[PDB]
Amino acid sequence: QINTEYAVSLLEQLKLFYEQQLFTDIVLIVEGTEFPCHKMVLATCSSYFRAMFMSGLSESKQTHVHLRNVDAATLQIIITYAYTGNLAMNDSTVEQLYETACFLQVEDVLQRCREYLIKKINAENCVRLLSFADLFSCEELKQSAKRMVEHKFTAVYHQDAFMQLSHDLLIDILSSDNLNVEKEETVREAAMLWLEYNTESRSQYLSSVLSQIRIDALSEVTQRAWFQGLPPNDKSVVVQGLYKSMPKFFKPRLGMTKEEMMIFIEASSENPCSLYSSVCYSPQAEKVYKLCSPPADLHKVGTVVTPDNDIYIAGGQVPLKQTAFRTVNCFYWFDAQQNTWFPKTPMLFVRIKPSLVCCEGYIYAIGGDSVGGELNRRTVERYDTEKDEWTMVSPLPCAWQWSAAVVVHDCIYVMTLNLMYCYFPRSDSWVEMAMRQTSRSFASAAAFGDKIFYIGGLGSSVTVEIYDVNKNEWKMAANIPAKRYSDPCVRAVVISNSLCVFMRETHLNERAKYVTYQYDLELDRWSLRQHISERVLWDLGRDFRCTVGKLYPSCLEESPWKP
Amino acid sequence: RQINTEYAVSLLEQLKLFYEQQLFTDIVLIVEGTEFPCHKMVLATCSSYFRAMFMSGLSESKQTHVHLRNVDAATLQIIITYAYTGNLAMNDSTVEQLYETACFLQVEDVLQRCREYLIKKINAENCVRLLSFADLFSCEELKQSAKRMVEHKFTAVYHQDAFMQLSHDLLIDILSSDNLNVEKEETVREAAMLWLEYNTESRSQYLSSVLSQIRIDALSEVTQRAWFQGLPPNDKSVVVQGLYKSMPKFFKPRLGMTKEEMMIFIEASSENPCSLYSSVCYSPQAEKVYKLCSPPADLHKVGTVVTPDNDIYIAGGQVPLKNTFRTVNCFYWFDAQQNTWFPKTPMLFVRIKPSLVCCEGYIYAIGGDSVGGELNRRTVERYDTEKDEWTMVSPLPCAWQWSAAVVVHDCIYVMTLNLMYCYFPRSDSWVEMAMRQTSRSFASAAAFGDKIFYIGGLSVTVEIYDVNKNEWKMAANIPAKRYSDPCVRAVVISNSLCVFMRETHLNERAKYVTYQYDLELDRWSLRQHISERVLWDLGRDFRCTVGKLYPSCLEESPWKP
Amino acid sequence: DKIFYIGGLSVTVEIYDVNKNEWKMAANIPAKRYSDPCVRAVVISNSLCVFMRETHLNERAKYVTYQYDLELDRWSLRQHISERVLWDLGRDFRCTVGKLYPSCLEESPWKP
């Protein structure tokens, strides 16, 4: 191999020459700023300077080149990267950095800024990044922007930059089958408002934008509104659209295929190769669709589903390369369509079984057997979904183990064996709450409306303690009627605007039975909503978690397994 | 910060590509008509002369066609390619010219690399040549190393052709030094004479200087008559100046005369509990116990060998892994004056307790757990003391453990439980020899004269073998106290066969005593009993070998009687 | 018409002939020392060949088949099986010669 010591010595000597200006022969003249540099470094880094000097043109012998349509700071950072290899990339100058990298065809920095932008893609810059990837040919960025823009924009459709988009880009966006919309009318009104941004600059594109939307809205309202905005005496558009909507037979999209499903993690892996897998139950389809394995079989993790219906994974441990397990603070995000886990910004401290709770767009991970264990062994930390970073919050006053947390009334409610503390995001403080009369642990709670339903606790039992936020008191309702001499595995969840329970029971010398019940809020009784047949759902285990979310049956595949 | 990953590698790759395509070049070197287009930046960062060549405001600074002379084309090309890729890839022949060109161009990194390569390759013959080379181009490390190697070997050769052509200052430094490895004072005198006979009437003043340097002890023997035979005519004051070198200038004894025949021991009972084993020495005549520094200071289970030129080598061994005994194939050599260990070319297989045998100037390592389970476990590997390399030879006939090997009549002999094979260095093959009637292992043999004396085994078995007769016979039993397990050690002492044995009983202390054995008497006469007041316990895995050492360089081992 | 008993505990090559009714040695297969050659002898395209794998300490297994000649008593290098297509087999694996259909069978997916 090439001697790295001599390579770094040569590089540092060249950078010293650059700083001291000894062997510089070519100077870059940009907006009156002198940039003394060499030809060898520029040729090695950029693919434009190699064609600027070794070409035989008038600049081959000229020692002063007036490089135009560039920026001084961008050129300076590119030169210093070419001379030392350090590329300091902030969150603002990456746009002009990519512009100048495409202006010098510097694939070295082009790849670096492409990776930075593939990491930086978020909701508030999705349309801007897609427009940037349309301006400069970049297929990876274009595809990532396609996916993220489709999802987040069809969720939001309010960005100001969406109005200033090319016709081809909008045709690609609207005609795609990856849009995430609960209805087919929101895309219609989004297209209408985009068209009405201008009057005559969009008339020619009117015949094309309607060609990608289904005819179910091409004969109903929002056709006379276009006639109102039609240019005067234009008889080539009204009669055109009058007899035009014959083709494009109505085909349902993919965004209207989200159903309230119970996502399960760390289930009993059918194949012994994996230790744990992930499955999902369909309360409506009455089937069990398989889910992608956790990233690097990440066990002992926590789940959260934001009000925007997004799944996240935090904490967990990976078997170190017989008992062998090491805890990692890696963070991941689940793609609802690609059926894969996209990595995100990792946490600061590793966790085991963390309680992920979403509130005000922030992901809160409370506790989880942190590595530190100092006097603040109860330190909790939130995540920024806008800036893609983690921020510490007010620590929990008391150290708790095997706890659960929910969000009610824009506040974090973490529950332990007998104590409860409410966190105020506005003031970053903890307030003492009501005290339970029973010592129970290893249970889960579901936030339904303005009440907290702590179900089960210790196997578990059928004890239920209902807490009211407005009343600040713990009261008993009833006990779930289950078979005696059994060990039910209770799982509290909210589904169909009602509090249902996923309770798996096992009898003596008998296999586990799956059945869910609907708890009557006013009657204080668990009614049999549906019985899960064992012909579709097999054993899941004991350390499995359940959460409420929506998934697409089309993108996912049915798990092939014998009843 | 110097980021050595992606950017660094890509940049150096593209720089090599440009050197190859002749791109962005602005300076070309003319070397006896050969053109070497290159860049000023690389020459400035690599060579400390090209930076002044292009930065100093003179004529060659801007001159594109520079005619650099007194430099070889191949050496400049290899220097340029090293500057452009970082790899030197130096051979063993063009080292001198490469070093000369590096010194002329003042390229520090390649200068250091060549200095290390030269200091590692003072084997047997280029010692005086590279010493003169280092005298011409000042190099303190090379000068000192070559001086020590010369003081070690030229004192035994003193006939090298290159030694004749030496500057006066270097010769004065060599001769006046007290590191001459000569057991006699006339050899240096005749060496100086022959250095002053081939070049006479040209270095007459230097002749007088060397005459004074060799001093009275050798000045009063023959030098006057030889000079009278060889003096130029009409020389009178030269007689006056030569007659003056009889009384003065501090006649003192030399150092090479102290080549006392002693015994080198390894893996002794360490005094400080922090250390496990130690290497010590014993003086048969001075009746003193000297110590030696451990070669690795942590690795044990080594094998010893002594060449006819009284050299000590260490090969193989095992060292603890020090996790929070691994075998290493390293090699070492003992310095007779610096009391240190200079490593040499390592072996190819990690052996455990190798048996090294010297023959025809080559070191032969026979057996010793080459590394472990092997397709052909019965295998050997020899060493070249001149070329400094390991050459594979014909393997062993049979696989043996705890074997011993000696050299007799310039032939390799290896002894095992009951079999013996003679290896022919000329034909590189093994010939079957006589088989012992007794099956004994864990013993060693000594090559005294023309007879091999296999002593011990499990005892006191004395089986004498003769090469000319090819037969095994018994002589007698060594007188040892009963209810004991003697540890026999057979080795040559002062051209007389002797043994070094230690007896151990129950609830009794070990006793060390050496006996004098006679060939026709078959009896071990009491030669000397080693007193415990000077020598302490050694152990069980200790080894013994015969060699000459310097008392002044070594240090006495402190121990309470 | 000759039986080739290869290996045993090694690289023992003992050739037997029905007509000659005798056991003889030919040569030793060129195998790196400090290795355990899993020899496998089988007929290939009406030509005697072998399939052997060598294993050392802290080293990866290598698969390579050699072409052996009757009168030369030497295993000429016929083809070295690249590890990019074939992975490790094991110790108790068996080898036999037969004709198969590629379309009916399926390729084994494995990362090079």
GROMACS .gro file of C-alpha atoms in nm, chain A residues 1-4 6-15 17-18 22-23 25 38-41 43-45 49-50 53-54 81-86 108 112, chain B residues 1-4 6-8 10-15 18 21-24 26 39-42 44-46 50-51 54-55 82-87 109 113:
model
   76
    1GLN     CA    1   0.000   0.000   0.000
    2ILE     CA    2   0.095   0.367  -0.036
    3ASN     CA    3   0.283   0.496   0.268
    4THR     CA    4   0.029   0.702   0.463
    6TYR     CA    5   0.458   1.028   0.344
    7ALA     CA    6   0.113   1.106   0.204
    8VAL     CA    7   0.013   1.312   0.508
    9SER     CA    8   0.357   1.476   0.518
   10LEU     CA    9   0.321   1.578   0.153
   11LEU     CA   10  -0.032   1.707   0.213
   12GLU     CA   11   0.067   1.916   0.515
   13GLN     CA   12   0.370   2.056   0.333
   14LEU     CA   13   0.150   2.152   0.038
   15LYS     CA   14  -0.098   2.319   0.274
   17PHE     CA   15   0.299   2.621   0.088
   18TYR     CA   16  -0.058   2.734   0.021
   22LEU     CA   17   0.558   3.016  -0.221
   23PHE     CA   18   0.494   2.817  -0.540
   25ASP     CA   19   0.150   3.053  -1.013
   38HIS     CA   20  -0.154   2.581  -0.756
   39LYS     CA   21  -0.253   2.394  -1.070
   40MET     CA   22  -0.173   2.043  -0.945
   41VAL     CA   23  -0.409   2.056  -0.646
   43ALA     CA   24  -0.643   1.942  -1.124
   44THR     CA   25  -0.639   1.658  -0.869
   45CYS     CA   26  -0.952   1.777  -0.686
   49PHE     CA   27  -0.957   2.280  -1.367
   50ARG     CA   28  -0.796   1.980  -1.536
   53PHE     CA   29  -0.529   2.422  -1.771
   54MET     CA   30  -0.443   2.108  -1.972
   81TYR     CA   31  -1.077   2.114   0.131
   82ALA     CA   32  -0.859   2.042  -0.172
   83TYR     CA   33  -0.554   2.149   0.028
   84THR     CA   34  -0.629   1.974   0.359
   85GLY     CA   35  -0.932   1.746   0.310
   86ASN     CA   36  -1.142   1.909   0.583
  108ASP     CA   37  -1.532   1.433  -0.399
  112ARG     CA   38  -2.016   1.454   0.062
  564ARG     CA   39  -0.602   1.814   1.085
  565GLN     CA   40  -0.464   1.576   0.821
  566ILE     CA   41  -0.755   1.353   0.717
  567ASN     CA   42  -0.581   1.043   0.581
  569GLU     CA   43  -1.085   0.937   0.111
  570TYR     CA   44  -0.947   1.280   0.014
  571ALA     CA   45  -0.581   1.197   0.096
  573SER     CA   46  -0.765   1.013  -0.401
  574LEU     CA   47  -0.530   1.319  -0.415
  575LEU     CA   48  -0.212   1.106  -0.404
  576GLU     CA   49  -0.357   0.869  -0.671
  577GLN     CA   50  -0.431   1.165  -0.906
  578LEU     CA   51  -0.082   1.316  -0.836
  581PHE     CA   52  -0.031   1.340  -1.347
  584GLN     CA   53   0.068   1.167  -1.806
  585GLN     CA   54   0.310   1.467  -1.799
  586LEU     CA   55   0.037   1.709  -1.692
  587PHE     CA   56   0.078   2.047  -1.520
  589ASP     CA   57   0.666   2.327  -1.526
  602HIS     CA   58   0.666   1.948  -1.050
  603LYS     CA   59   0.827   2.207  -0.825
  604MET     CA   60   0.589   2.149  -0.533
  605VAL     CA   61   0.678   1.781  -0.485
  607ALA     CA   62   1.019   2.134  -0.260
  608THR     CA   63   0.826   1.923  -0.009
  609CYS     CA   64   1.053   1.619  -0.048
  613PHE     CA   65   1.506   2.184  -0.453
  614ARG     CA   66   1.317   2.425  -0.225
  617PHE     CA   67   1.319   2.716  -0.682
  618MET     CA   68   1.255   2.970  -0.402
  645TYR     CA   69   0.949   0.784  -0.403
  646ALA     CA   70   0.848   1.150  -0.372
  647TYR     CA   71   0.546   1.085  -0.594
  648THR     CA   72   0.429   0.761  -0.427
  649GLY     CA   73   0.604   0.722  -0.089
  650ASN     CA   74   0.755   0.382  -0.168
  672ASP     CA   75   1.336   1.090   0.476
  676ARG     CA   76   1.574   0.514   0.529
   0.00000   0.00000   0.00000
